[PDB]
Amino acid sequence: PEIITPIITPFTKDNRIDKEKLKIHAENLIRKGIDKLFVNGTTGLGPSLSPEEKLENLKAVYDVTNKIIFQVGGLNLDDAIRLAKLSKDFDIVGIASYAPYFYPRMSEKHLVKYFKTLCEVSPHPVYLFNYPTATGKDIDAKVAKEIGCFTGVKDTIENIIHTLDYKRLNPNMLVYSGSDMLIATVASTGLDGNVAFGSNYLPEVTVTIKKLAMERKIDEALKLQFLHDEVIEASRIFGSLSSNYVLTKYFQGYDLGYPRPPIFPLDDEEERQLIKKVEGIRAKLVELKILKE
Amino acid sequence: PEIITPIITPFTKDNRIDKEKLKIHAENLIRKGIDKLFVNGTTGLGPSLSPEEKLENLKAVYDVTNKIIFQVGGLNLDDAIRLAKLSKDFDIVGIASYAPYFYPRMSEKHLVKYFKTLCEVSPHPVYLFNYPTATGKDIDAKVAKEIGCFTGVKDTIENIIHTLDYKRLNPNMLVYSGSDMLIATVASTGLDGNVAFGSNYLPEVTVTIKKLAMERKIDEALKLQFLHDEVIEASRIFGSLSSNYVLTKYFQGYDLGYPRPPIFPLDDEEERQLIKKVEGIRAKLVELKILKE
Amino acid sequence: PEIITPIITPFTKDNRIDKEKLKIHAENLIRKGIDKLFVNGTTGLGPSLSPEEKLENLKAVYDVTNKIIFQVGGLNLDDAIRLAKLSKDFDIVGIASYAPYFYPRMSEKHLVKYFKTLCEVSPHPVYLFNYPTATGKDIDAKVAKEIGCFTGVKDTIENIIHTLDYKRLNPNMLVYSGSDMLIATVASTGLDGNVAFGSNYLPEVTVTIKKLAMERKIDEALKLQFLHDEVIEASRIFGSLSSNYVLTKYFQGYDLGYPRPPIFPLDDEEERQLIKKVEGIRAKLVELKILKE
Amino acid sequence: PEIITPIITPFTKDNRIDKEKLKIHAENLIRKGIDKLFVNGTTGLGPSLSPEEKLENLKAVYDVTNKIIFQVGGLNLDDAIRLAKLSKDFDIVGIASYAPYFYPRMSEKHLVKYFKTLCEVSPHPVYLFNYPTATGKDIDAKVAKEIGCFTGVKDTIENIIHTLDYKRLNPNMLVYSGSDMLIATVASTGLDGNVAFGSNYLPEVTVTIKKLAMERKIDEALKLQFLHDEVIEASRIFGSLSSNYVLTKYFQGYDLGYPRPPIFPLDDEEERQLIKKVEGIRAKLVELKILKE
């Protein structure tokens, strides 16, 4: 199984993408063993980026690595189509889209039509990003089968039965979980890995959990998994999408600038208090030699 | 109380705003007794619109009426701020924003700061659009009080207890419902009216329900409310946001063009089945002398 | 419209029904204008009573008043049937049942069969008690129509659209709300009243809200309604089912003994603090002359 | 890890416990490799049983095996206390209770006191049965830690993160899942097993899945898990609790009598359609040599 980082988009003080900070972040991720980078995902504030900014992010990351899944979705199908076609000139793993968000009570026929349109135009394999809490819709294993063109799915949901059903109904589909708390479990139960937002700031931890689980050291994997779980809880105190910036600077030693408001940056006191919550976890990760200080 | 139309955005075949069809629609709604027009709402596919397109919608409706609430929100606060400021040169009722959508687990502090920022820059009264199913967040009466700068709220939620609580904690706030099935109830329980998506296609019905309720003819207001409920139920079969285009053409006699995919238009057969579902209702309404012909 | 009290079941220190305290409570309720008493409902800890205790409660209340709706439901259909038949010798308003609780994923056919069986044996009109949160199932207006034998329904749900749909599909059915916060709204919108748990301790308030609303004094009704809303919030601090005992003693001047554990009685400090929360509301109700001290 | 059967309660035509059919069933389950029997659970219609009937179920299964967890909970704490104490004279694995059901908005303090009371009186280890959908309350890992006296937990919930959290906060607690679709996953991620309702009718399947998973043959455990998933899906068509009677007769060859209404038995046609839905699965299982014949 794989660990895929939904990579953070660093912004400047003037609310532009800070490409050089992004390249440094992507470079470190790959060096630490991340298999692939999911660009323009939730953690990257994809929904807050213009089409032109989504392309900007692809080009920056591609200067570091071609192991990219390129998220192109949005509420303007013409823009999503254009981004899909633009990717033909890149040697990337695939494109991806979440379901059309905001609008509830969308018909299944229209949801299927949206994804089938993206498949019809894609020059690359297509990954379903299923995130029912964020988008308001579930593209479950039956619907994914009906759509019929997905190479893989990322299932972000509080229900691993739902995730397993993709393998059950689509046995040749790649199936990933979006739950950082399930890295050990996903690996142990025959699924294909995790798209882990916490791998932005603790890539060492996420790959080691998975490796321990694949070495049949489940107890050791769960011990490390439970420590990762505690860092995730701390990031939720002040909002995980904002806190991800602070935690990456803290654990990896370079800064990712700013989020894009309304994803507001933590102030200096929130940062202080967040670091207080994870300081001891860092110390234990250093002792275990997962972190080189 | 008032009926406010979240006005549909007509699109061209090549996915541009059809300003001419939009003026025709706005003129009819005002002519038929609609009090104000809510622009770039859900029914107008506001989240599908770029900032420039949101302002293009304002300019077109502004050629018809000053009775406009201008929705400006989105996931780029700089863009929403820019639209709020640009509205100074329009003599309109107010601006409005739904909560930041898509992202779950946003802190209350960040949500409050988002709305307060818009208030600080607004040259007009500010209206909260609360729509928890669509945005994933609830800005309830307590948080609205905390934010402290709203002139009104539109509460799109089936729980009218929630809606009444805005009046109980903010007695000077205008309080509207977004649930078309509650026009008679809202008007009769002391609230300030409905932003009614079905007033796009049956403004005569929505206005007459409000009138009967104001006269305390509640039994007669319910009979018409219950017929209106049946048209909403029919609109959902193929998807409400797409079906509203078809229903406005059927009942009001003019074309509103296309929606913006992934809000796909109904096909000719879907149109036929929908008309068949409501043509009896139209007869019942002609008989009742609410609709001509 | 009517105010119906789901009457509290007082228990002794030895976990038996205190019949004499119940008779005093029922007597006061009727004297203060409550139209009818719903016996063995949620507020009466019906689900915690044996069949024999449910009958006990009927006989005690019937010594005071025949205006009784007798709740008989449970997970042993044979017992529910026996209680239904036993009521033939009483001149009561009707029997009632909530849907079979605990078990999820019950088929609609089995739910319909359960209620139709109770109708087949009832010597009195039958009321549907719909409480989806408590039972896990919704017996909505379509299902109630399918069942076809309900004289009335009590809808306890956070959604007045749902409640109105019973009138829309069953125009000759009595339709009540179980939301104490909606007394004014229910009366104003053409529904038949409220089964109000707060009428146990403030029957004066509940009947006056309804009366003001029917006198077309909606503002005055809402003012009193919002004060009742504040008492309900206070009862939730420590658990409303337990707090109902303390609040009835406080406002009505007689005690109702104890609840049945696990509905634990508040201790003396919780009681102190609860009274602190409503002390000022009592003072304002005295000033308004709704309460005679 | 272990497979534990929440054993079905067979009823007679006249609605009494059929002790003879219950012993036959318990004997077969032990014979086929089931580790322990959970008595008066959901699958056994425990909430439909009186206290005397819960004890009658214990005595009957106790004639067969000592490997019993005895569920004793209910809405009369005196009755649950009495059953806990009566269990002293049985050499069994432990007692158990689901949370107080039906009543919403029970305070955490009252829920904690309920479980602590049972612990104080118990002559055996105490197991928490957590089933939020059925009871309306969640007793999560933190509250279980607060209660502090549980030897194990059965977590009936699709979110395995929730289940894992019991191990993370209570490392010495036995942690079981109640989701049959997760037997392979649970066994492979370091948890202590499943209380599997489908082990009533396919104990051979449930035991073999656990075995394959323990051998780290996860792919082969998933294939059998996915066939087991199909039988559960078929059981839901007409209602799982009723259908389990029919499925145990089909697969294990002996009659388990009737359920207790409103858990109504399937009718002869419903039985035929269910068998038709699973007879292919039976062939696939015979072919795989998991079932004889």
mmCIF file of all heavy atoms in Angstrom, chain C residues 15 42 45 47-48 75 77-78 102-104 110 131 134 241 260-262 264, chain D residues 15 42 45 47-48 75-78 102-104 110 113 134 241-242 261 264:
data_model
loop_
_atom_site.group_PDB
_atom_site.id
_atom_site.type_symbol
_atom_site.label_atom_id
_atom_site.label_comp_id
_atom_site.label_asym_id
_atom_site.label_seq_id
_atom_site.Cartn_x
_atom_site.Cartn_y
_atom_site.Cartn_z
ATOM 1 N N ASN C 15 -39.627 2.840 44.202
ATOM 2 C CA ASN C 15 -39.763 2.609 42.761
ATOM 3 C C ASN C 15 -41.130 2.031 42.390
ATOM 4 O O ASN C 15 -41.247 1.191 41.498
ATOM 5 C CB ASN C 15 -38.641 1.696 42.255
ATOM 6 C CG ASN C 15 -38.345 1.888 40.766
ATOM 7 O OD1 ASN C 15 -38.704 2.910 40.169
ATOM 8 N ND2 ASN C 15 -37.671 0.915 40.170
ATOM 9 N N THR C 42 -43.561 9.501 26.786
ATOM 10 C CA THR C 42 -42.145 9.641 27.100
ATOM 11 C C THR C 42 -41.945 10.342 28.432
ATOM 12 O O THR C 42 -41.227 9.851 29.316
ATOM 13 C CB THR C 42 -41.447 10.434 25.996
ATOM 14 O OG1 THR C 42 -41.641 9.777 24.745
ATOM 15 C CG2 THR C 42 -39.953 10.577 26.308
ATOM 16 N N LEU C 45 -42.337 8.395 31.411
ATOM 17 C CA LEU C 45 -41.465 7.214 31.420
ATOM 18 C C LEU C 45 -42.223 5.948 31.035
ATOM 19 O O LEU C 45 -41.972 4.858 31.568
ATOM 20 C CB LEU C 45 -40.773 7.031 32.775
ATOM 21 C CG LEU C 45 -40.050 8.269 33.284
ATOM 22 C CD1 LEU C 45 -39.135 7.941 34.448
ATOM 23 C CD2 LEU C 45 -39.264 8.938 32.151
ATOM 24 N N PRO C 47 -42.016 3.944 28.501
ATOM 25 C CA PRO C 47 -41.178 2.797 28.117
ATOM 26 C C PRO C 47 -40.542 2.093 29.298
ATOM 27 O O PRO C 47 -40.136 0.940 29.155
ATOM 28 C CB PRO C 47 -40.124 3.424 27.191
ATOM 29 C CG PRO C 47 -40.808 4.647 26.619
ATOM 30 C CD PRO C 47 -41.669 5.165 27.744
ATOM 31 N N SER C 48 -40.474 2.734 30.464
ATOM 32 C CA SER C 48 -39.930 2.127 31.668
ATOM 33 C C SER C 48 -40.975 1.432 32.529
ATOM 34 O O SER C 48 -40.621 0.880 33.577
ATOM 35 C CB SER C 48 -39.235 3.195 32.510
ATOM 36 O OG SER C 48 -38.435 4.038 31.698
ATOM 37 N N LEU C 75 -42.634 -3.546 23.018
ATOM 38 C CA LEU C 75 -42.008 -4.540 22.150
ATOM 39 C C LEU C 75 -42.604 -5.934 22.323
ATOM 40 O O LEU C 75 -42.115 -6.899 21.714
ATOM 41 C CB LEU C 75 -40.498 -4.558 22.397
ATOM 42 C CG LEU C 75 -39.752 -3.328 21.887
ATOM 43 C CD1 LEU C 75 -38.254 -3.456 22.263
ATOM 44 C CD2 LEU C 75 -39.895 -3.119 20.395
ATOM 45 N N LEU C 77 -46.105 -7.311 21.494
ATOM 46 C CA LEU C 77 -47.384 -6.971 20.894
ATOM 47 C C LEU C 77 -48.551 -7.584 21.664
ATOM 48 O O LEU C 77 -49.616 -6.959 21.761
ATOM 49 C CB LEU C 77 -47.385 -7.408 19.433
ATOM 50 C CG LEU C 77 -48.581 -6.987 18.578
ATOM 51 C CD1 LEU C 77 -48.853 -5.502 18.715
ATOM 52 C CD2 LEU C 77 -48.344 -7.336 17.121
ATOM 53 N N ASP C 78 -48.365 -8.775 22.252
ATOM 54 C CA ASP C 78 -49.432 -9.383 23.045
ATOM 55 C C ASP C 78 -49.824 -8.499 24.223
ATOM 56 O O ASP C 78 -51.016 -8.374 24.543
ATOM 57 C CB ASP C 78 -49.013 -10.763 23.545
ATOM 58 C CG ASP C 78 -49.048 -11.811 22.448
ATOM 59 O OD1 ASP C 78 -49.663 -11.556 21.391
ATOM 60 O OD2 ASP C 78 -48.465 -12.894 22.647
ATOM 61 N N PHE C 102 -35.964 0.716 19.656
ATOM 62 C CA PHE C 102 -34.683 0.018 19.681
ATOM 63 C C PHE C 102 -34.267 -0.534 18.323
ATOM 64 O O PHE C 102 -33.242 -0.120 17.780
ATOM 65 C CB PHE C 102 -34.677 -1.134 20.690
ATOM 66 C CG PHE C 102 -33.285 -1.567 21.076
ATOM 67 C CD1 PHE C 102 -32.665 -1.044 22.198
ATOM 68 C CD2 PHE C 102 -32.587 -2.484 20.300
ATOM 69 C CE1 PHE C 102 -31.369 -1.440 22.550
ATOM 70 C CE2 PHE C 102 -31.296 -2.870 20.645
ATOM 71 C CZ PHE C 102 -30.699 -2.341 21.773
ATOM 72 N N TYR C 103 -35.020 -1.475 17.770
ATOM 73 C CA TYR C 103 -34.518 -2.190 16.598
ATOM 74 C C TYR C 103 -34.496 -1.283 15.375
ATOM 75 O O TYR C 103 -35.536 -0.746 14.997
ATOM 76 C CB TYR C 103 -35.354 -3.433 16.330
ATOM 77 C CG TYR C 103 -35.499 -4.322 17.548
ATOM 78 C CD1 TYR C 103 -36.725 -4.480 18.182
ATOM 79 C CD2 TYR C 103 -34.412 -4.980 18.078
ATOM 80 C CE1 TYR C 103 -36.858 -5.288 19.286
ATOM 81 C CE2 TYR C 103 -34.538 -5.776 19.182
ATOM 82 C CZ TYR C 103 -35.750 -5.926 19.784
ATOM 83 O OH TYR C 103 -35.857 -6.745 20.883
ATOM 84 N N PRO C 104 -33.339 -1.076 14.737
ATOM 85 C CA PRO C 104 -33.325 -0.338 13.467
ATOM 86 C C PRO C 104 -33.607 -1.220 12.267
ATOM 87 O O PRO C 104 -33.755 -2.446 12.391
ATOM 88 C CB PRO C 104 -31.902 0.244 13.419
ATOM 89 C CG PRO C 104 -31.089 -0.688 14.204
ATOM 90 C CD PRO C 104 -31.984 -1.370 15.215
ATOM 91 N N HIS C 110 -43.698 -4.382 8.373
ATOM 92 C CA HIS C 110 -43.835 -4.789 9.765
ATOM 93 C C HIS C 110 -44.288 -3.627 10.637
ATOM 94 O O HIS C 110 -45.092 -3.810 11.557
ATOM 95 C CB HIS C 110 -42.504 -5.360 10.256
ATOM 96 C CG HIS C 110 -42.164 -6.683 9.653
ATOM 97 N ND1 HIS C 110 -40.992 -7.355 9.942
ATOM 98 C CD2 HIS C 110 -42.858 -7.484 8.811
ATOM 99 C CE1 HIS C 110 -40.971 -8.500 9.283
ATOM 100 N NE2 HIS C 110 -42.095 -8.607 8.598
ATOM 101 N N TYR C 131 -42.146 9.709 16.975
ATOM 102 C CA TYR C 131 -40.999 10.254 17.698
ATOM 103 C C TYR C 131 -39.755 9.597 17.117
ATOM 104 O O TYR C 131 -39.222 8.643 17.681
ATOM 105 C CB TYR C 131 -41.125 9.974 19.195
ATOM 106 C CG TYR C 131 -40.245 10.803 20.090
ATOM 107 C CD1 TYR C 131 -40.395 10.751 21.468
ATOM 108 C CD2 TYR C 131 -39.260 11.639 19.564
ATOM 109 C CE1 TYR C 131 -39.593 11.518 22.309
ATOM 110 C CE2 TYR C 131 -38.451 12.404 20.402
ATOM 111 C CZ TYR C 131 -38.625 12.331 21.768
ATOM 112 O OH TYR C 131 -37.840 13.084 22.604
ATOM 113 N N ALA C 134 -36.473 9.127 19.302
ATOM 114 C CA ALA C 134 -36.557 8.164 20.399
ATOM 115 C C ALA C 134 -36.702 6.723 19.910
ATOM 116 O O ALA C 134 -36.161 5.797 20.531
ATOM 117 C CB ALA C 134 -37.721 8.530 21.312
ATOM 118 N N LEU C 241 -36.058 15.145 31.503
ATOM 119 C CA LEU C 241 -36.979 14.182 32.111
ATOM 120 C C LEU C 241 -36.844 14.138 33.633
ATOM 121 O O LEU C 241 -37.843 13.992 34.350
ATOM 122 C CB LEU C 241 -36.752 12.795 31.526
ATOM 123 C CG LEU C 241 -37.184 12.601 30.074
ATOM 124 C CD1 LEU C 241 -36.680 11.257 29.582
ATOM 125 C CD2 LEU C 241 -38.712 12.720 29.923
ATOM 126 N N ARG C 260 -37.858 7.201 37.669
ATOM 127 C CA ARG C 260 -37.414 5.819 37.758
ATOM 128 C C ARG C 260 -36.022 5.696 37.156
ATOM 129 O O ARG C 260 -35.866 5.880 35.937
ATOM 130 C CB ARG C 260 -38.382 4.888 37.032
ATOM 131 C CG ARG C 260 -37.845 3.483 36.894
ATOM 132 C CD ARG C 260 -38.930 2.534 36.465
ATOM 133 N NE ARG C 260 -39.756 2.128 37.595
ATOM 134 C CZ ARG C 260 -40.824 1.345 37.507
ATOM 135 N NH1 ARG C 260 -41.224 0.874 36.325
ATOM 136 N NH2 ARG C 260 -41.503 1.040 38.603
ATOM 137 N N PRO C 261 -34.998 5.380 37.954
ATOM 138 C CA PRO C 261 -33.625 5.194 37.413
ATOM 139 C C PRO C 261 -33.600 4.121 36.343
ATOM 140 O O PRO C 261 -34.217 3.057 36.514
ATOM 141 C CB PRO C 261 -32.815 4.764 38.645
ATOM 142 C CG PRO C 261 -33.583 5.317 39.819
ATOM 143 C CD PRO C 261 -35.039 5.225 39.425
ATOM 144 N N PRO C 262 -32.843 4.325 35.250
ATOM 145 C CA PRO C 262 -31.797 5.339 35.029
ATOM 146 C C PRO C 262 -32.205 6.779 34.761
ATOM 147 O O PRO C 262 -31.331 7.583 34.435
ATOM 148 C CB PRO C 262 -31.066 4.796 33.788
ATOM 149 C CG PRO C 262 -32.127 4.052 33.067
ATOM 150 C CD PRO C 262 -32.891 3.352 34.148
ATOM 151 N N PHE C 264 -32.439 9.423 36.666
ATOM 152 C CA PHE C 264 -32.070 9.628 38.056
ATOM 153 C C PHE C 264 -32.606 10.972 38.536
ATOM 154 O O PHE C 264 -32.666 11.937 37.770
ATOM 155 C CB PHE C 264 -30.549 9.599 38.235
ATOM 156 C CG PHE C 264 -29.927 8.222 38.101
ATOM 157 C CD1 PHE C 264 -29.293 7.840 36.920
ATOM 158 C CD2 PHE C 264 -29.948 7.319 39.161
ATOM 159 C CE1 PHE C 264 -28.706 6.594 36.797
ATOM 160 C CE2 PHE C 264 -29.373 6.063 39.033
ATOM 161 C CZ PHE C 264 -28.742 5.703 37.853
ATOM 162 N N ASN D 15 -45.742 -17.499 21.809
ATOM 163 C CA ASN D 15 -44.909 -16.376 22.251
ATOM 164 C C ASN D 15 -44.156 -16.617 23.561
ATOM 165 O O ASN D 15 -43.931 -15.682 24.340
ATOM 166 C CB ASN D 15 -45.773 -15.102 22.359
ATOM 167 C CG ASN D 15 -44.951 -13.817 22.253
ATOM 168 O OD1 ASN D 15 -43.799 -13.844 21.837
ATOM 169 N ND2 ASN D 15 -45.556 -12.691 22.608
ATOM 170 N N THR D 42 -29.329 -7.814 20.942
ATOM 171 C CA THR D 42 -30.268 -7.335 19.937
ATOM 172 C C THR D 42 -30.789 -8.481 19.092
ATOM 173 O O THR D 42 -31.999 -8.605 18.861
ATOM 174 C CB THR D 42 -29.581 -6.313 19.019
ATOM 175 O OG1 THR D 42 -29.010 -5.274 19.811
ATOM 176 C CG2 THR D 42 -30.577 -5.736 18.033
ATOM 177 N N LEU D 45 -33.387 -10.405 20.534
ATOM 178 C CA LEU D 45 -34.540 -9.595 20.951
ATOM 179 C C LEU D 45 -34.562 -9.347 22.459
ATOM 180 O O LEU D 45 -35.611 -9.388 23.097
ATOM 181 C CB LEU D 45 -35.852 -10.237 20.505
ATOM 182 C CG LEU D 45 -35.956 -10.599 19.028
ATOM 183 C CD1 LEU D 45 -37.362 -11.085 18.694
ATOM 184 C CD2 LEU D 45 -35.535 -9.423 18.139
ATOM 185 N N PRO D 47 -34.249 -6.585 24.351
ATOM 186 C CA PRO D 47 -35.196 -5.538 24.789
ATOM 187 C C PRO D 47 -36.650 -5.983 24.747
ATOM 188 O O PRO D 47 -37.472 -5.406 25.461
ATOM 189 C CB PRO D 47 -34.929 -4.385 23.809
ATOM 190 C CG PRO D 47 -33.504 -4.609 23.318
ATOM 191 C CD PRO D 47 -33.363 -6.124 23.261
ATOM 192 N N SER D 48 -36.996 -6.999 23.946
ATOM 193 C CA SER D 48 -38.357 -7.519 23.951
ATOM 194 C C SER D 48 -38.624 -8.470 25.113
ATOM 195 O O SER D 48 -39.780 -8.881 25.302
ATOM 196 C CB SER D 48 -38.659 -8.239 22.637
ATOM 197 O OG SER D 48 -38.308 -7.450 21.511
ATOM 198 N N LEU D 75 -34.665 -0.465 31.265
ATOM 199 C CA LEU D 75 -35.036 0.864 31.728
ATOM 200 C C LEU D 75 -35.530 0.862 33.169
ATOM 201 O O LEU D 75 -35.982 1.902 33.662
ATOM 202 C CB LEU D 75 -36.090 1.463 30.803
ATOM 203 C CG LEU D 75 -35.610 1.731 29.367
ATOM 204 C CD1 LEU D 75 -36.750 2.370 28.565
ATOM 205 C CD2 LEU D 75 -34.371 2.612 29.335
ATOM 206 N N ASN D 76 -35.437 -0.276 33.848
ATOM 207 C CA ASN D 76 -35.691 -0.395 35.283
ATOM 208 C C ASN D 76 -34.386 -0.901 35.908
ATOM 209 O O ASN D 76 -34.044 -2.079 35.777
ATOM 210 C CB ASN D 76 -36.856 -1.336 35.559
ATOM 211 C CG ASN D 76 -37.191 -1.426 37.043
ATOM 212 O OD1 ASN D 76 -36.413 -1.938 37.835
ATOM 213 N ND2 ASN D 76 -38.363 -0.938 37.412
ATOM 214 N N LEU D 77 -33.659 -0.008 36.579
ATOM 215 C CA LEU D 77 -32.352 -0.364 37.116
ATOM 216 C C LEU D 77 -32.459 -1.394 38.228
ATOM 217 O O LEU D 77 -31.572 -2.248 38.367
ATOM 218 C CB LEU D 77 -31.632 0.901 37.594
ATOM 219 C CG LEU D 77 -30.196 0.743 38.127
ATOM 220 C CD1 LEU D 77 -29.308 -0.026 37.173
ATOM 221 C CD2 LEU D 77 -29.602 2.114 38.413
ATOM 222 N N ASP D 78 -33.531 -1.352 39.022
ATOM 223 C CA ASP D 78 -33.736 -2.409 40.000
ATOM 224 C C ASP D 78 -33.758 -3.782 39.328
ATOM 225 O O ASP D 78 -33.205 -4.752 39.860
ATOM 226 C CB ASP D 78 -35.025 -2.170 40.777
ATOM 227 C CG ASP D 78 -34.933 -0.981 41.727
ATOM 228 O OD1 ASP D 78 -33.835 -0.405 41.882
ATOM 229 O OD2 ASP D 78 -35.975 -0.623 42.321
ATOM 230 N N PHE D 102 -34.179 4.549 24.159
ATOM 231 C CA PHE D 102 -35.383 5.338 23.908
ATOM 232 C C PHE D 102 -35.158 6.805 24.252
ATOM 233 O O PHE D 102 -35.139 7.644 23.346
ATOM 234 C CB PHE D 102 -36.607 4.804 24.664
ATOM 235 C CG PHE D 102 -37.938 5.400 24.178
ATOM 236 C CD1 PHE D 102 -38.791 4.668 23.356
ATOM 237 C CD2 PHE D 102 -38.324 6.678 24.548
ATOM 238 C CE1 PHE D 102 -40.019 5.204 22.916
ATOM 239 C CE2 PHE D 102 -39.551 7.220 24.108
ATOM 240 C CZ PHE D 102 -40.388 6.472 23.289
ATOM 241 N N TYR D 103 -34.960 7.123 25.538
ATOM 242 C CA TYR D 103 -34.916 8.523 25.981
ATOM 243 C C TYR D 103 -33.738 9.278 25.369
ATOM 244 O O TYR D 103 -32.593 8.862 25.549
ATOM 245 C CB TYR D 103 -34.840 8.594 27.508
ATOM 246 C CG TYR D 103 -35.970 7.847 28.180
ATOM 247 C CD1 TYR D 103 -35.729 6.689 28.911
ATOM 248 C CD2 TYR D 103 -37.288 8.281 28.050
ATOM 249 C CE1 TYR D 103 -36.757 5.998 29.512
ATOM 250 C CE2 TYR D 103 -38.332 7.594 28.655
ATOM 251 C CZ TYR D 103 -38.062 6.455 29.383
ATOM 252 O OH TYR D 103 -39.093 5.765 29.988
ATOM 253 N N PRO D 104 -33.974 10.369 24.642
ATOM 254 C CA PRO D 104 -32.856 11.193 24.159
ATOM 255 C C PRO D 104 -32.387 12.185 25.220
ATOM 256 O O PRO D 104 -33.047 12.446 26.231
ATOM 257 C CB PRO D 104 -33.441 11.923 22.945
ATOM 258 C CG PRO D 104 -34.817 11.317 22.709
ATOM 259 C CD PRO D 104 -35.252 10.780 24.035
ATOM 260 N N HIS D 110 -25.691 10.811 34.219
ATOM 261 C CA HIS D 110 -26.678 9.775 34.492
ATOM 262 C C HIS D 110 -26.324 8.476 33.784
ATOM 263 O O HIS D 110 -26.456 7.391 34.371
ATOM 264 C CB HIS D 110 -28.073 10.267 34.106
ATOM 265 C CG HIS D 110 -28.628 11.282 35.059
ATOM 266 N ND1 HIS D 110 -29.848 11.898 34.871
ATOM 267 C CD2 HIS D 110 -28.124 11.787 36.210
ATOM 268 C CE1 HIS D 110 -30.071 12.736 35.867
ATOM 269 N NE2 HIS D 110 -29.040 12.693 36.690
ATOM 270 N N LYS D 113 -23.516 6.877 35.804
ATOM 271 C CA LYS D 113 -24.028 6.300 37.042
ATOM 272 C C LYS D 113 -24.725 4.980 36.778
ATOM 273 O O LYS D 113 -24.597 4.039 37.564
ATOM 274 C CB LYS D 113 -24.966 7.307 37.708
ATOM 275 C CG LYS D 113 -25.531 6.927 39.067
ATOM 276 C CD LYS D 113 -26.409 8.067 39.582
ATOM 277 C CE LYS D 113 -27.054 7.747 40.913
ATOM 278 N NZ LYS D 113 -26.052 7.583 41.977
ATOM 279 N N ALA D 134 -29.205 2.086 17.939
ATOM 280 C CA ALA D 134 -30.308 1.426 18.613
ATOM 281 C C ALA D 134 -30.715 2.153 19.887
ATOM 282 O O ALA D 134 -31.909 2.203 20.218
ATOM 283 C CB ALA D 134 -29.922 -0.024 18.936
ATOM 284 N N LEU D 241 -33.713 -9.132 11.540
ATOM 285 C CA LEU D 241 -34.012 -9.862 12.763
ATOM 286 C C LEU D 241 -35.002 -10.983 12.502
ATOM 287 O O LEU D 241 -34.899 -12.056 13.102
ATOM 288 C CB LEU D 241 -34.560 -8.905 13.823
ATOM 289 C CG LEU D 241 -33.543 -7.893 14.368
ATOM 290 C CD1 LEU D 241 -34.250 -6.959 15.313
ATOM 291 C CD2 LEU D 241 -32.386 -8.590 15.078
ATOM 292 N N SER D 242 -35.978 -10.744 11.622
ATOM 293 C CA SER D 242 -36.876 -11.813 11.205
ATOM 294 C C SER D 242 -36.168 -12.802 10.285
ATOM 295 O O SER D 242 -36.374 -14.014 10.390
ATOM 296 C CB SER D 242 -38.095 -11.218 10.491
ATOM 297 O OG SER D 242 -38.780 -10.294 11.323
ATOM 298 N N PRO D 261 -43.329 -10.663 17.766
ATOM 299 C CA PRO D 261 -43.890 -9.430 17.161
ATOM 300 C C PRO D 261 -43.741 -8.243 18.091
ATOM 301 O O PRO D 261 -43.924 -8.373 19.312
ATOM 302 C CB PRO D 261 -45.371 -9.785 16.948
ATOM 303 C CG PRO D 261 -45.361 -11.271 16.742
ATOM 304 C CD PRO D 261 -44.245 -11.814 17.619
ATOM 305 N N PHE D 264 -42.008 -9.487 13.153
ATOM 306 C CA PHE D 264 -42.900 -10.499 12.617
ATOM 307 C C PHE D 264 -42.116 -11.518 11.795
ATOM 308 O O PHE D 264 -41.126 -11.178 11.149
ATOM 309 C CB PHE D 264 -43.985 -9.867 11.734
ATOM 310 C CG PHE D 264 -44.922 -8.949 12.482
ATOM 311 C CD1 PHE D 264 -44.774 -7.577 12.406
ATOM 312 C CD2 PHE D 264 -45.959 -9.464 13.240
ATOM 313 C CE1 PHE D 264 -45.637 -6.719 13.099
ATOM 314 C CE2 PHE D 264 -46.820 -8.623 13.943
ATOM 315 C CZ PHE D 264 -46.664 -7.237 13.861
#
